[PDB]
RNA sequence: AUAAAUUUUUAAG
RNA sequence: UUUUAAGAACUAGAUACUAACACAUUUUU
């Protein structure tokens, strides 16, 4: 038991599981938002 | 027959310390 | 996973729904207020809610005085303290 | 030669000694990567 | 008594989903699982300074303290949590924010960061 | 990179000597796969 | 919304009143849920010719948790309707208004490898049809 | 002209 | 005095707590 536990807990932004959800929350709304400014266009 | 062949005891040898003769080398 | 998780299991449960329907038990100290005062029932019940109360009193009551400086704390535990006795107040009158 | 032998034999005993959970992978992993280094370099001796 | 136990002893009637239901029932009386609180160990990422004793909590701290899940929802959904932390010195009580846009903490309420 | 590679000599002594300045062992310190290729394969193996 | 008239050949799937609860009254006082004969629709956009299959709610008696068995049986009824069509009137593809019924549907249709199945990319208004007059006649 | 056969699990930290 | 919670029925599906334990990670493209 030497580093942070806090890598060890789920809450935490920092480690890649939750990282890479929100990347994926992202990209789709990112899709999501170009289709709908290509429909206005 | 154990003739001299295999080991002291299959122990620590992890095998089985199964021999056969061999059939290879003979005449 | 503190016991705060395993206090509250089914298996811990489940054997305090027996104890209410087969004897005496059910504590007091877990459930909460209950809200309402006129909706409390047989006499012998609301005595054990009333000393539910008092306890507080007497915990919070003793935590007045003492001198660990922090006066706007004091001061919300102090409006904690009258809500708490009006409450008692409200279990007497019911009774 | 005996040496080398031995030097084999005390990795191994690295491998183990240093892992105490890894896992499982890292595990067949790190002796492979022991043994073919091992066989590869040694090919012909070891057979006698 | 084993830390790690395969089977518990039930009783002999024990309708399991009847149990779920008036165990359902049970889960809204009680105090403590209806707390809308929580309480989790934790460290202090961005170290810190008390704003009330000018304490500092120098980088990353053992802390006994209180997470809450925010109402609050990043993005359309995304949860986001506020913890606090008390101060060793005073007491005093300290939040945080967990941004997942911004992989970052940013705090509020009796602490500032370091820089 | 062969052009660059000419401009390489003394690989062997540097790759015996890594083990003196860095902790962790290369297990096979006895090619560089740039200058001798690759000596072996497996994935037949495999497949068996 | 093109693709619907090329050569191919796709039906279209409404659940949606499969399942209906309406609120009656009870003879002290209440809100009464019950459960009125739903229907399955499904029309090609060429033909228009309307497959329903009617459902009568004494089937519900038995159960509880009736969204997965309404899901299930429906998709049932679109295999079955599929079993109903001779190689060249098998549909080429199948689309739902509701992402809900994906997968009881790959689970009935893969004997159908021949036959997709896909979403709706736009709402649409096979929910309240209904409303038309013969059929909501036909299924009363 | 050979008949040569090792093991095997629980608690605590 | 003030105050509203409690009961019945229905729905689909995964999430919290603990880190004391181990952390050359090496290596084939
Ligand atoms: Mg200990
Ligand atoms: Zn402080």
Excluded at chain 2, 1 to 27: C, D, E, M
Excluded at chain 4, 13 to 18: E, P
Excluded at chain 6, 31 to 48: E, I, P
Excluded at chain 7, 59 to 66: E, H, I, N, S, T
Aim: with cysteine; net charge positive; glycine share 4%.
């Amino acid at each position: 038991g030497s580093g942070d536990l806090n890598l060890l807990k789920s809450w935490n932004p920092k480690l890649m599981k939750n990282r890479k959800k929100v990347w994926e929350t992202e990209q789709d709304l990112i899709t999501e938002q170009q289709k709908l400014n290509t429909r206005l266009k | 027959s154990y003739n001299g062949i295999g080991l002291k005891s299959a122990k620590g040898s992890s095998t089985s310390g199964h021999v056969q003769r061999s059939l290879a080398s003979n005449n | 996973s503190r016991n705060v998780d395993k206090a509250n299991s089914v298996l811990v449960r489940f054997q305090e729904q027996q104890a209410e329907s087969a004897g005496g038990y059910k504590d007091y100290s877990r459930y909460q207020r209950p809200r309402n005062v006129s909706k409390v029932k047989s006499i012998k019940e609301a005595n054990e809610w009333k000393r539910q109360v008092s306890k507080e009193i007497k915990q919070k009551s003793t935590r007045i005085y003492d001198p660990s400086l922090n006066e706007m704390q004091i001061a919300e535990l102090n409006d904690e303290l009258n809500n708490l006795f009006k409450e008692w107040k409200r279990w007497q009158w019911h009774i | 030669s005996e040496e080398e032998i031995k030097k084999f034999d005390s990795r191994i005993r690295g491998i183990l000694m240093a892992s105490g959970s890894t896992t499982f992978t890292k595990v067949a992993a790190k002796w492979n990567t022991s043994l073919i280094s091992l066989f590869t370099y040694f090919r012909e001796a070891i057979v006698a | 008594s084993e830390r790690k136990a395969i089977n518990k002893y039930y009783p002999p009637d024990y309708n399991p989903l009847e149990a779920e239901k008036l165990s359902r029932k049970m889960a809204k009386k009680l105090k403590t699982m209806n707390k809308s609180h929580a309480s989790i160990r934790l460290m202090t990422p961005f170290s810190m300074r008390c704003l009330e004793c000018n304490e500092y909590i120098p980088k990353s701290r053992k802390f006994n303290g209180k997470k809450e899940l925010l109402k609050e929802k990043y993005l359309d959904s995304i949860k986001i949590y506020r913890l606090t932390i008390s101060c060793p010195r005073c007491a005093n009580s300290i939040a945080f924010r967990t941004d997942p846009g911004n992989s970052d903490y940013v705090m509020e309420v009796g602490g500032v960061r370091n820089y | 990179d062969r052009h660059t590679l000419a401009y390489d000599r003394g690989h062997r002594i540097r790759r015996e000597f890594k083990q003196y300045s860095l902790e962790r062992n290369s297990p096979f310190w006895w090619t560089n796969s740039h200058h001798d290729g690759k000596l072996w394969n497996l994935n037949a193996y495999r497949t068996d | 919304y093109a693709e619907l008239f090329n050569n191919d050949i796709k039906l279209f799937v409404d659940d949606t009143n499969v399942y209906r609860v309406t609120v009656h009254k009870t003879f002290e006082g209440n809100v009464a849920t019950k459960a009125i004969n739903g229907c399955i629709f499904t029309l090609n956009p060429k033909t228009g010719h309307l497959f329903l299959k009617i459902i009568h709610t004494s089937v519900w008696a038995g159960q509880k948790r009736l969204s997965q068995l309404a899901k299930w049986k429906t998709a049932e009824e679109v295999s079955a309707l599929v079993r109903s069509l001779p190689k060249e009137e098998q549909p080429k593809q199948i689309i739902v208004t509701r992402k809900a019924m994906l997968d009881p549907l790959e689970v009935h249709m893969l004997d159908f490898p021949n036959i997709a199945i896909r979403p709706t990319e736009l709402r649409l208004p096979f929910s309240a049809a209904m409303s038309i007059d013969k059929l909501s006649d036909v299924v009363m």
